[PDB]
Amino acid sequence: SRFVKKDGHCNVQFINVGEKRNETLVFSHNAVIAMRDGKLCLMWRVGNLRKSHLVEAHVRAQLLKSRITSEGEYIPLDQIDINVGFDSGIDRIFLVSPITIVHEIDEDSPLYDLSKQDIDNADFEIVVILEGMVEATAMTTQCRSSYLANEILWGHRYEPVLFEEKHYYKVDYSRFHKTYEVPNTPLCSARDLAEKK
Amino acid sequence: SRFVKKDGHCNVQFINVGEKTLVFSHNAVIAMRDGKLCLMWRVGNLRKSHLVEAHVRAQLLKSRITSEGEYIPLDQIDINVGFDSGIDRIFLVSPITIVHEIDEDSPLYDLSKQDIDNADFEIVVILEGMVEATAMTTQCRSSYLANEILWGHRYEPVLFEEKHYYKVDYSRFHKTYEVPNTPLCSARDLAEKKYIL
Amino acid sequence: SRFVKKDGHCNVQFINVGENETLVFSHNAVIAMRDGKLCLMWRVGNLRKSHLVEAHVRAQLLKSRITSEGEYIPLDQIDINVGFDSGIDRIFLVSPITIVHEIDEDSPLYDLSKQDIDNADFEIVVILEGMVEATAMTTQCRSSYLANEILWGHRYEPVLFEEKHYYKVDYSRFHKTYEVPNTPLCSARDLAEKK
Amino acid sequence: SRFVKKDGHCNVQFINVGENETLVFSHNAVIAMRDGKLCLMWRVGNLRKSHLVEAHVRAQLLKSRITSEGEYIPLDQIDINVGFDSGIDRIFLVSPITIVHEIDEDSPLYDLSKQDIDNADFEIVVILEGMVEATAMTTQCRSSYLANEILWGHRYEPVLFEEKHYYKVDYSRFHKTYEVPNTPLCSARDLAEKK
């Protein structure tokens, strides 16, 4: 029943992990946008197929997009930060079971004015990073991945992979990339939801 | 008389260290500290070398339903141990009592003593750092179930001053003593009972 | 089309890289306008074929000063903000990046004008730190820009171009810049009061 | 002239060093006025021949205390702000640096006048951490200052002097200080309320 034991070990068992070809940090194939605790959020999944703990793990993200300044300066692929908790320190994660990374689309978010329709014709790329030190090694690892606009499933949630069994927990990685539609999901941008109230 | 010499060596002797690393108190406590309700736990280094760039984190593990009806097998909720002012970083020599101020932002804000004896959640505690003279970042973990938190308790002092040095009695590390003067209500209740004035 | 593939590999090819040694800083620094704000900028790049993990930047202005109490400080270091407060001092370095310092009210350059720079006497030390992929060794690349090495009214020449399916980085344009005669010759303080 | 060259090497030469050691703290700490604020200062240096990567400092005040609840705390470790909030706790050490703690309303020394420090019995633990250049090890240097090792009305002697082309650091001046009679004898609070 306890996820973590008094000595540090975790009562978790992983099934459907696949060949050792994986056994490393992994990102969900798709990204999603949906309501969470009353706010429109951009979310994606991260998992450690390996068997060791990832020390001082922390996540980052950036929206890549070319732009022109008022000065007329052209910038190839400006890198705009996507807030995933740095300010409060919740960008730092304890990864044992797959975690869902959440980005609140607030007034400061670069996606603040994007609706489902906008995302359809959008032309940007979101780069996601996971970094940390693999247990028993002196090397800090940097796992990367990316989500194009058309790779973001609006109105979807991730299928649970953590199941509570008898005095123990099991993680089913065959559900890692799985998502499901949530019709009730608002279709307007986060900004419209802010004014709507 | 000083705890640290000008050369960096500590004037501390350890006794009753037991038989052969890092370690966490068996229990956690909740008592009044500086006029505020706090959740506390102990962390110590039974080793000889200093811990470099050591820091602590904590998380409340519990399943919940989002306001949108979404079920999360085991949501991870951060428990503030000083990250905002950098005091999550510690200088670990003799056992240290990590303090979580249970204020309006704590997920434990509205938890009374009765709510604890009946609640069902897990508090995961982490301590990371590098053992001196090594290129390895260590991660020590532990956890406290709701019934492992002693409401109205304090830890027994382990550090004592001698003629020209300090002694650390580890046989008292896990020891705690009761304080019947401790309120049985939650932090919120204690806040209202004061703001009325 | 995309810059980073799902497997984490970067869809980029570097040409004219030369024969060389790890990280590199642009020869000159520039001062120009950007989104209604006069900024101090300099380029940083990674020639090495690997990735720079947990990479982040820092800058400092060095200059002797006498304290209001008469104390003399040889080369007092004044921090130059490049994003630490929000965490954008941490970069994902692949294609050469332009580090940006907004010359605001809290900046030590908030009073310098082009004329002031041409007559100024200070040094800006720029730092880039991070870990070379698969190495437990965090490297520190350093450089410096004297007041005269700061090109007032200049912008860097683009080095990233969109090809058919991939992206190419032309390092022969790394240190190159072009003039912006429209750049204000006054200081940031004036531009702020001119409202 | 310049302290740091384009390639990252520093134009500095050290003399009167001895026997090329490691990190070091000034034997004494001082309290003096700096830019209108009463500050607690101490010196830190790198006698090693390599650069210290991602270096930063920390300080704590060790002192037993009684809580309003009557709980006895053998040695509480109250933190001394040396710049964490703005990130200026992160230093670039090539020549001896003076760490500054601004004694403000949030400082545990806010209500301490000279006379007070003469009777005090507390202890300040100072720390310096960083990675030795080219190694994979993070080092930690420690020291401390008792209330009687704090020099009120003092400032450190300069160790960095400008030569014609480079800069020399004279370590024989590391621990030395000189008097500043002008120094207020009242606590930082007194100076604050005296306005």
- Optimal mutation site among B60, B72, B76, B83, interface A, most CBs of chain A within 10 A: B76
Output DSSP code: residue C93: -
| Cα–Cα distance measured from residue C60 to residue B14, given in angstroms and rounded to the nearest whole number | 44
Please give the interface size between A and C, counted as residue pairs whose CB atoms are below 8 Å apart: 76
What contacts A153, CB < 8 A, 6 or more positions away?
A: A30, A31, A32, A33, A179
| Cα–Cα distance measured from residue D126 to residue D149, given in angstroms and rounded to the nearest whole number | 13
- Of A72, A35, A14, A6, nearest to A190 by C-alpha is A35
Q: What residue has token string 């909720």?
A: B77
User: ∠A14-A20-A24 over CA atoms, to 5°?
Assistant: 75
| Cα–Cα distance measured from residue A139 to residue A50, given in angstroms and rounded to the nearest whole number | 15
Q: What residue has token string 């940031």?
A: C188
What contacts C194, CB < 8 A, 6 or more positions away?
A: none
Cα–Cα distances in Å, from A92 out to A101, B78, D62?
11, 10, 30
Token pair recorded at residue A93 = 């994660």
Contact D142 B50 (CB under 8 A): yes
3-state secondary structure B140-192: EEEEEEHHHEEECEEECCCEEECCCCEEEEHHHCCCEEECCCCCCCCHHHHHH
Structural contact between residues C131 and C140, judged by C-beta atoms closer than 8 angstroms? no
**Which chains reach chain C with 3 or more Cβ–Cβ distances below 8 angstroms?**
A, D
- Of C12, C160, C9, C1, nearest to A125 by C-alpha is C1
Token pair recorded at residue A183 = 């019709």
Question: DSSP of A19-80, one letter per residue?
Answer: -TTT-SEEE-SSEEEEEETTEEEEEEEEEE-SSS-EEEEEEEEEEEEEEE-TT--EEEEEEE
Token pair recorded at residue B190 = 């204690």
H helix count then E strand count, chain C: 2, 14
Beta bridge partners of B96: B43
The 10 Å Cβ neighbour count of residue C100 is 16
Contact D125 B4 (CB under 8 A): yes
C78 φ/ψ angles, rounded to the nearest 5 degrees:
-110, 125
Q: From its phi and psi, is residue B133 left (phi > 0), alpha (psi between -120 and 50) or beta?
A: left
Output DSSP code: residue C191: H
- Give the CB-side neighbour count of residue C113, counting CA atoms within 13 A: 9
CB contacts, 8 Å: B168 with chain D: none
CB contacts, 8 Å: C139 with chain D: 53
Contact A6 B142 (CB under 8 A): yes
CA A56 to chain CA centroid, Å, is 17
Q: What is the CA radius of gyration of chain C?
A: 18
CB contacts, 8 Å: C86 with chain A: 81, 86-87
Token pair recorded at residue B34 = 């500086």
What contacts C71, CB < 8 A, 6 or more positions away?
A: D32, D34, D155, D180
Question: In this complex, which of D27, D75, D140 lies closest to B6 when CB atoms are compared?
Answer: D27
Residues of C with CB under 8 A from a CB of D: 25, 27, 58, 60, 62, 67-69, 71-75, 77, 79, 84-85, 123, 125, 127, 129, 136-144, 146
| Cα–Cα distance measured from residue A54 to residue A45, given in angstroms and rounded to the nearest whole number | 16
Kindly report the length of chain C: 195
Question: DSSP of chain D, one letter per residue?
Answer: --SB-TTS-B-EEEES------EEEEEEEEEEEETTEEEEEEEEEE-SSS-EEEEEEEEEEEEEEE-TT--EEEEEEEE--SSGGGTTTEE--SS-EEEEEE--TTSTTTT--HHHHHH---EEEEEEEEEETTSS-EEEEEEEEEGGGEEETEEEPP-EEE-SSSEEEEGGGSS-EEE-TT---S-HHHHHH--
What contacts C119, CB < 8 A, 6 or more positions away?
A: none
Output DSSP code: residue C157: P
- Optimal mutation site among C4, C89, C91, interface A, most CBs of chain A within 10 A: C4
- Of C88, C91, C80, nearest to C23 by C-alpha is C91
- Of D26, D28, D40, D35, nearest to D187 by C-alpha is D40
Question: DSSP of chain B, one letter per residue?
Answer: --SB-TTS-B-EEEE------EEE-SSEEEEEETTEEEEEEEEEE-SSSPEEEEEEEEEEEEEEE-TTS-EEEEEEEE--SSGGGTTTB---SS-EEEEEE--TTSTTTT--HHHHTT---EEEEEEEEEETT-S-EEEEEEEEEGGGEEETEEEPP-EEE-SSSEEEEGGGTT-EEE-TTS--S-HHHHHHHHHT-
In chain D, how long is the greatest CA-to-CA distance?
A: 63
Sign of the CA dihedral running B187, B193, B194, B196: positive
- Optimal mutation site among A73, A126, A143, A152, interface C, most CBs of chain C within 10 A: A73
Question: Which residue from B minimizes the CA distance to A85?
Answer: B78
Structural contact between residues C83 and C96, judged by C-beta atoms closer than 8 angstroms? no
Question: In this complex, which of B91, B133, B159 lies closest to D127 when CB atoms are compared?
Answer: B91
Contact D95 C74 (CB under 8 A): yes
| Cα–Cα distance measured from residue C102 to residue B100, given in angstroms and rounded to the nearest whole number | 37
| Cα–Cα distance measured from residue A110 to residue B102, given in angstroms and rounded to the nearest whole number | 34
Min Cα distance C32 → chain D (Å) is 22
What contacts B196, CB < 8 A, 6 or more positions away?
A: none
Beta bridge partners of D145: D124
Contact C77 D92 (CB under 8 A): yes
Min Cα distance C151 → chain A (Å) is 16
Structural contact between residues C76 and C21, judged by C-beta atoms closer than 8 angstroms? no
3-state secondary structure A99-126: EEEEEECCCCCCCCCCCHHHHHHCCCEE
Sign of the CA dihedral running B161, B162, B168, B171: negative
- Of C24, C54, C56, nearest to C42 by C-alpha is C24
Output DSSP code: residue A90: T
B92 φ/ψ angles, rounded to the nearest 5 degrees:
-90, 110
Question: In this complex, which of B53, B161, B179 lies closest to D129 when CB atoms are compared?
Answer: B53
Q: Which amino acid, residue B27? A: N
Element (H, E) at A195: helix A190-196
- Of A65, A58, A67, A108, nearest to A86 by C-alpha is A58
Output DSSP code: residue C166: S
Q: What is the CATH number of the domain that holds B104?
A: 2.60.40.1400
Q: Residue A144: helix, strand or coil by DSSP?
A: strand
Structural contact between residues A133 and A56, judged by C-beta atoms closer than 8 angstroms? yes
Token pair recorded at residue B18 = 């037991």
| Cα–Cα distance measured from residue B130 to residue B118, given in angstroms and rounded to the nearest whole number | 38
| Cα–Cα distance measured from residue C113 to residue C119, given in angstroms and rounded to the nearest whole number | 10
Output DSSP code: residue A159: P
CA C46 to chain CA centroid, Å, is 13
Question: Which residue from A minimizes the CA distance to B88?
Answer: A89
CB contacts, 8 Å: A157 with chain B: 70
- Of B140, B104, B110, nearest to B125 by C-alpha is B140
Cα–Cα distances in Å, from C31 out to A77, C35, C115, C181, C184?
20, 13, 13, 12, 10
CB contacts, 8 Å: B135 with chain A: 138
Cα–Cα distances in Å, from A3 out to A162, A165, B63, C126?
11, 11, 12, 46
Question: In this complex, which of C58, C73, C141 lies closest to D90 when CB atoms are compared?
Answer: C58
User: ∠B143-B145-B147 over CA atoms, to 5°?
Assistant: 140
- Of B139, D130, C130, nearest to A136 by C-alpha is B139
The tally of domains found in chain C comes to 1
Question: In this complex, which of B57, B139, B143 lies closest to A2 when CB atoms are compared?
Answer: B143
Question: In this complex, which of C69, C85, C141 lies closest to D8 when CB atoms are compared?
Answer: C141
Q: What technique determined this structure?
A: X-ray
- Order of strands across the sheet that contains C123-132: C72-79, C52-66, C123-132, C138-146
The 10 Å Cβ neighbour count of residue B147 is 12
The 10 Å Cβ neighbour count of residue B107 is 17
The dihedral over CA atoms of A19, A21, A26, A28, expressed in degrees to the nearest 10, equals -60
What contacts A9, CB < 8 A, 6 or more positions away?
A: none
CA A57 to chain CA centroid, Å, is 14
Structural domain boundaries, residue C188? 1-195
The 10 Å Cβ neighbour count of residue C189 is 18
Q: What's this structure's resolution in Å?
A: 2.4
